[PDB]
Amino acid sequence: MMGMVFTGLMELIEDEFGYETLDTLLESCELQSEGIYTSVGSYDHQELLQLVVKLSEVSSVPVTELVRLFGKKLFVELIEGHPEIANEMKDSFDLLSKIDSFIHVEVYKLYPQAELPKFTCDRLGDNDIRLHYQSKRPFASFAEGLLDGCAEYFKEDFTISRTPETQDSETDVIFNITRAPRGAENLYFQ
Ligand code: HEM
DSSP states (O other), rough: OOHHHHHHHHHHHHHOSSSHHHHHHHHHHSSSSSSOSSSSSOHHHHHHHHHHHHHHHHHHOOHHHHHHHHHHHHHHHHHHOOHHHSSSSOHHHHHHHHTTOOOIHHHHHOOOSSOOOEEEEESSSEEEEEEEEEEEEEEEEHHHHHHHHHHHHHOEEEEEOOOTTOOOOOOOOEEEEEOOOOOOOOOOOO
């Protein structure tokens, strides 16, 4: 949803940086009518990168710290945004189970402009989960922002890691998600 992420971007720059700063951003892309068309249109990916680059120059904000804050705000926007989308879900682990089975099936059927990659889930056990992600445009900071944001609304603490074998390789990325020890504090026995 390129239209929906545009709405999220306008709210974030105006509220935390200013309206004058917000005005400079709208000049880099340039308006045409008002600026807020609501979520219903789809723009290119270069459109997203062009405003992102202006952010690193107009406010001097790093592209990695900006991508982290961005993921947190938009994800919690969808949670309170759709009560039946969070009602059907029962937990974060269950989220991974139908993250593409039904959540991205409704999105895909709705508008065909969106394009998604491939996702395969392997389950090593109860505290071990592996996710395979095949895409030619893999940004780890982007995916982590979305998974941790989810654990932000639920209020939890999971750890998302990565493996160094494909750590610096595109197309194939291996992620390891584990549950950090919690619940009292049992190291082992005594
Ligand atoms: C944290 C949970 C979810 C994960 C892990 C996830 C992740 C992703 C990823 C990785 C993509 C595309 C990334 C890329 O190709 O660069 C994507 C795009 C998208 N997701 Fe999700 N998604 C999740 C939940 C949701 C939810 C809740 C919905 C909304 C009901 C949803 C709707 C979409 C849409 C509309 C796109 C397409 C955006 C675009 O085309 O640029 N996602 N999702």
